[PDB]
Design a protein around this ligand. Sequence first.
Ligand SMILES: Nc1ncnc2c1ncn2[C@@H]1O[C@H](COP(=O)(O)O)[C@@H](O)[C@H]1O
Ligand SMILES: Nc1ncnc2c1ncn2[C@@H]1O[C@H](COP(=O)(O)O)[C@@H](O)[C@H]1O
Ligand SMILES: NC(=O)CC[C@H](N)C(=O)O
Ligand SMILES: NC(=O)CC[C@H](N)C(=O)O
Ligand SMILES: [Cl-]
Ligand SMILES: [Cl-]
Lengths: 495, 497
Amino acid sequence: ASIFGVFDIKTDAVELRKKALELSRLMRHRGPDWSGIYASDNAILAHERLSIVDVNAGAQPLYNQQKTHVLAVNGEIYNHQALRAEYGDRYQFQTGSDCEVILALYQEKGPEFLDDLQGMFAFALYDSEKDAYLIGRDHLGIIPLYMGYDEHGQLYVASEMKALVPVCRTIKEFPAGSYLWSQDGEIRSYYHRDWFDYDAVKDNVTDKNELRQALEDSVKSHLMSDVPYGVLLSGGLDSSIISAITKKYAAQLHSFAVGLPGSPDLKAAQEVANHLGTVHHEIHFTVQEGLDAIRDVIYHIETYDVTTIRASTPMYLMSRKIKAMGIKMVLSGEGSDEVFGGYLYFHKAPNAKELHEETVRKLLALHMYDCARANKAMSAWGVEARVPFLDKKFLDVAMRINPQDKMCGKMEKHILRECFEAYLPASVAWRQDGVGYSWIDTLKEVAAQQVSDQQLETARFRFPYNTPTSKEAYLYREIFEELFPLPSAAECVPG
Amino acid sequence: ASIFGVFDIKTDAVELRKKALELSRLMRHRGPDWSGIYASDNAILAHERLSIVDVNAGAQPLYNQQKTHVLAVNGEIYNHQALRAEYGDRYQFQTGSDCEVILALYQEKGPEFLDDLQGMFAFALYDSEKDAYLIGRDHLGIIPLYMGYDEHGQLYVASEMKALVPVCRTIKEFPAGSYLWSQDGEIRSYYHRDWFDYDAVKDNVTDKNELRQALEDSVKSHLMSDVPYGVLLSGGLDSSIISAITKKYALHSFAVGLPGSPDLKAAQEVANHLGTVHHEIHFTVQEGLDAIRDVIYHIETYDVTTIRASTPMYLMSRKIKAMGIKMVLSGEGSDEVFGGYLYFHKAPNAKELHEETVRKLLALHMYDCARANKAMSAWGVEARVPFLDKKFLDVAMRINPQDKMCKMEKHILRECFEAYLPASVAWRQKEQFSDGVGYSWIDTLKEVAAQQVSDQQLETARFRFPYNTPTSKEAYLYREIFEELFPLPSAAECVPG
Ligand SMILES: Nc1ncnc2c1ncn2[C@@H]1O[C@H](COP(=O)(O)O)[C@@H](O)[C@H]1O
Ligand SMILES: Nc1ncnc2c1ncn2[C@@H]1O[C@H](COP(=O)(O)O)[C@@H](O)[C@H]1O
Ligand SMILES: NC(=O)CC[C@H](N)C(=O)O
Ligand SMILES: NC(=O)CC[C@H](N)C(=O)O
Ligand SMILES: [Cl-]
Ligand SMILES: [Cl-]
């Protein structure tokens, strides 16, 4: 879904509403199902839905029973069932939407219920009674959210920067693990955990069976949906586990892998799918198909980062292929490397202290990284991506085991392999460019054509911020800028 | 799907290729499934697909076995199976696509096979051997297609004017029942029928069974598909007729309206009668209101009537697609065929009637075909219209027009399909003073226009909209958005005055 909100209105609200319709529509690929808008003299909440749960009645914006509170959410509240039970006493549910609990929660706790939600999301809520608003983003910013200001000082928020660039003088990412309560006027962090610090877990007790079961429960809970769903299977450990787990609790399970015809990963993926027994779909794309998509990928992910761009491409095309099949949601394996210190550089880790701090740090930066890519790549085509490895509960267990246990002094994510070896082929289980070498190669080769050594030499004059230092980056930048003129838009991009 | 083509290339081909992507992308809603493209120094063909038939190998552009011929099509060729059979001994089919047949016929007939096809389509074919191209559009302009030229003379073709406006100096609709063979350089009409003239059918007999059978067959042929499809049910005669036949030969049905509308009611009835899985789609006036701009952009017209009518269709499609349906059948064409409108009550004689129907069929491309196609297409949904099938048209257009004369409007049709439906339905007349979708829709549309357009703006319209000046506040409202979206003079001119 997409969310779009305008707060602190100081102008013709009428005109603003007309404009909101326009800007919201810019993100309609995220919510192809239906459009919703709420507009008053003091606030606007525009919504583009992708119905996953409560098809018929999960229409948004969701309204107060009394109709004084209005909510627009992009996300999934996994524990909503539990919450309905708990507050159902106090609040009158109007639908079956998982998102409705935020409305219950707010009614009783005001702005203080963020850590009570389990799931991924971004929302904007408007209380006509108190003439107040609340904006929030999940714990690690799994669901993206941007914010910015008009030349009037009016406040804007949108799932994608794409809808703000046209009106804001400034924009920035809506901080993850946080909320914005109008009465307070300041963004406050709500997500904190003991494990944020080493000295907190340092001599903890690792419980493998706990770890495994934790990931199982995460997956299980992320299976919530009223539409057809699938799993991304790349043949890598992370998606192999997710798919394995998913297969395990699916009770027809579709798997998807993407790549240049004949590439290695494809083979791995096929192997796993065959071992797990899923109805696999090997998506192929040609190098030219990828080239031709670059610009749109860039418009979708909203970045000029080479690596992200190179990687979102395939994902972007896989998504179009999935959606065409009719699948609206998929589970993926992002977060695993960050939780378990999956990177090779982690092999090189100095000690458990260093390891821990790095992973934490990595977890806290994901909203700008893997999260953004997955979400936006998939949403380009109206496909929802779930990340069980990043589930709230799971993380507490995985971040709380002893971090020595994460040290490679073994395969990189040993403990994890150990936990699921049984579910997989020995090959993936203990394995340590699969989409196609040619993919990045032509990429590079095309950049070198399109970019003069001259351009590169004086890039600092053109792109003073995060000056591109290679012709490929140079190329992605030009397009980025072309699409996202505003100077702060590039500052959202990690320097 | 969508088709985008550029021919007679006099500039940097590389350059142009980049632009084609850009422009082709503007119509992606019509072919969300996948994208394809062929680019050379002399021709570009870009396609956005909506896979209905042969999902796995039906990709486009479609190529020649020798890869010397390239074809890009938006359409459904109903008699393709028969053709494959007819021409398989000469042409090696590379796919299961109903559309590849065009490649085969072009191979054995050059540009003279247009009337061999039975279906709806718009296509562009480029022959790298001969360095030539051929553009064609179905018999009544069922599927849309625009043409235009560059400041350099380069020629463009596109399913929607939206893809041309940004680059052409001039533009126009690619003529219906026509083709453009590059070797000719002139657009030629290929469709003509004796029934085009009254003296041709004046003494004809009327075959009820013949007529029933013909509609039946058309529908049967129209069910051709590899994906899930449905029917658009209004509860009105036409759509009810279509629906019943589909049920019998084939089932999800769809109706749209304001909570409480006549259409919604009537459709429920029929759905009940037929036993289809019925989906009643509601919309609110504000949702309708909020969609106007998109609607104008999708349909590419400023015509008040069409806009009114297409809004609900566009919202309905959004929903059908959310349910996963890619194709549906519609009852459009019936009234034009049987003289089903109220005005037809006042027809002086069969001649005037017959003559009037013909006119109507031949203008459809600017009207109802446009709405039907373009409204559904805004959400990647394909609309089929059995009543306008070529072969059906030949039977229906050839019966005694005197049988078209109106006790009830479409009596014959009723007599013919009486069996299928609940009599209440079959002999259901239309009423002036009742709005299917809900009276509030227009009422609000008018209301909004009045409030947004000044008397003066209206009085001075001519200084602003010198071509087909809007004569009402509503017309003005729509025209203003239109112009705003398609800033090119000839665009406005494609819209029938
Ligand atoms: N060919 C592919 N097919 C399906 N999913 C893929 C493919 N390549 C990558 N992914 C997904 O991307 C996830 C996280 O990205 P990463 O771990 O950064 O490679 C994997 O754990 C998979 O769910
Ligand atoms: N309310 C509706 N719900 C579903 N389909 C509709 C509805 N109204 C019209 N249609 C379809 O559109 C066709 C042509 O409409 P018309 O051109 O207005 O007579 C019908 O005969 C139906 O297939
Ligand atoms: N697209 C989304 O963000 C999903 C919203 C909500 N869970 C629904 O399925 O309606
Ligand atoms: N979208 C269309 O015009 C359909 C083209 C062809 N019939 C197919 O199913 O691929
Ligand atoms: Cl800002
Ligand atoms: Cl022209």
